[PDB]
């Protein structure tokens, strides 16, 4: 209950308290015959009569209502952090329960000490939190949480995001050429700023569209990171079953020794540790059946030859069935070039919007939204198959290229040129990385020659 009235970052304090309780149970069991700690824990978690427990339910509640809409990812450190000027304050979490000190860590001093110890985990989310989450949710909770996140992304993409996409597609220019190098960098910046004026001045853009995109990106990032943590716990679980399953390591054969005979000697050294044959020889039919089933469960883990992220990406691709995303067939029969009827051009416009320097009294996009915004945008682009067209056709990349060529620097409508190209380069690096990862995880129309009259 104390977990249920706190944010997601308190999962570490939760498992610490659970470990204290387990140690208490172990100590008291030396003299008293209590219920197994698993039985007590399941009874307290409402996980006996029901599939999922309170901890996983609150984990999903926290995700939905506080984690996706309030945290900012950092790619290099691999950590989330709360946003500045938070978008959601409607959580209304349960009121904290209180009790005597011996139901918490054990005393006033111990309570203070442990609170100080775990206060260090409060202002970020990172690998340790994911370890605890996986370890407490198991396959059941992980699967249910991923399914619910898929439902959330489906609702968001086919809901508010779709409406804003339609509106902005209406507002975008009908035709937009990429000017030639001879036009200049200042001229090209002025041209882009004039053409995208309606998108630049759209008030609700940065406060609604970017918020929902950040939510989607945070969801997919959570799926990726939680899968990585699950694999990392599975490998450790397997490293401990090896002795009882006969998985010897490779031994060092010195001069004049046979690897096969050496390994046979090692195997016969450890043969007493091998569990299944020992029970088969000395055990009972029911014991043998249970041992076989348990060994089969133990040795087969997702870390060895299975993956989950690609299935999530395919399911998400199945949600973009509206015709607005892909647009109508190209006139020339190959691909749109100067038209703006595809999502990747809308994203290029949004990139132009958030690559402009801002005033000191305002907040930058990475201060408010982090890296989830770009993960969402690049995911949408990649799933539709528009990544290469996006790379070739893009206002910001074109401006960066031309400015690099001619090396100019001025101010256009209160937008310094050199600073803008530097920001564009940084975001280009980030976008290339994201696109490359997404392509990695996902692993012909011929034409007729002319006919003589």
């Amino acid at each position: 209950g104390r977990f249920e009235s706190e944010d997601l970052t308190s999962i570490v304090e939760l498992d610490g308290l659970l470990e204290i309780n387990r140690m208490t149970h172990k100590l008291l069991s030396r003299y008293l015959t209590l219920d197994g700690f698993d039985a007590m824990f399941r009874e307290a978690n409402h996980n006996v009569s029901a599939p999922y427990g309170r901890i996983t339910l609150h984990v999903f509640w926290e995700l939905n209502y506080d984690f996706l809409p309030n945290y900012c990812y950092n790619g290099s450190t691999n950590r989330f952090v709360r946003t500045v000027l938070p978008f959601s304050q409607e959580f209304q979490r349960d009121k904290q329960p209180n009790a005597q000190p011996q139901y918490l860590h054990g005393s006033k001093a111990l309570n203070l000490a442990y609170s100080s110890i775990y206060g260090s985990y409060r202002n970020f989310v990172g690998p340790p939190h994911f370890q605890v989450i996986c370890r407490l949710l198991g396959y059941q909770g992980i699967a249910v949480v991923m399914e619910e996140l898929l439902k959330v992304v489906k609702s968001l993409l086919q809901g508010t995001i779709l409406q804003y996409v339609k509106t902005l597609m209406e507002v975008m220019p009908k035709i937009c050429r990429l000017p030639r190098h001879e036009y200049g960098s200042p001229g090209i910046l002025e041209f882009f700023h004039h053409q995208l004026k309606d998108i630049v001045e759209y008030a609700e853009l940065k406060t609604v569209c970017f918020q929902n995109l950040r939510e989607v990106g945070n969801a997919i990032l959570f799926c990726l990171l939680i899968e990585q943590s699950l694999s990392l716990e599975e490998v450790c679980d397997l490293l401990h079953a090896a002795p009882f399953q006969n998985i010897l390591p490779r031994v060092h054969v010195k001069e004049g020794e046979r690897l096969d005979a050496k390994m046979k000697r090692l195997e016969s050294k450890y043969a007493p540790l091998h569990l299944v044959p020992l029970i088969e020889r000395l055990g009972t039919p029911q014991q043998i059946a249970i041992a076989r089933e348990g060994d089969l469960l133990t040795k087969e883990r997702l870390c060895c030859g299975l993956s989950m992220f690609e299935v999530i990406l395919t399911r998400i691709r199945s949600f973009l069935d509206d015709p607005i995303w892909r647009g109508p067939l190209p006139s020339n029969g190959v691909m749109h070039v100067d038209e703006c009827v595809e999502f990747h051009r809308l994203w290029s416009a949004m990139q132009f919007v958030y690559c402009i320097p801002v005033g000191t009294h305002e907040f930058t996009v990475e201060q408010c939204f982090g890296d989830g915004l770009h993960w969402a945008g690049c995911m949408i682009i990649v799933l539709l198959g528009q990544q290469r067209r996006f790379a070739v056709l893009d206002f910001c990349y074109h401006l960066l290229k031309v400015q690099k060529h001619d090396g100019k620097d001025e101010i256009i409508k209160n937008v310094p040129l050199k600073k803008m190209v530097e920001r564009i380069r940084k975001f280009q690096i980030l976008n290339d990385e994201i696109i490359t990862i997404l392509d990695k995880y996902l692993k012909v129309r011929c034409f007729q020659p002319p006919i003589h009259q």
Partner: peptide
């Protein structure tokens, strides 16, 4: 989602 209704 509907599990949100259930938890509510």
């Amino acid at each position: 989602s509907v599990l949100l209704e259930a938890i509510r």
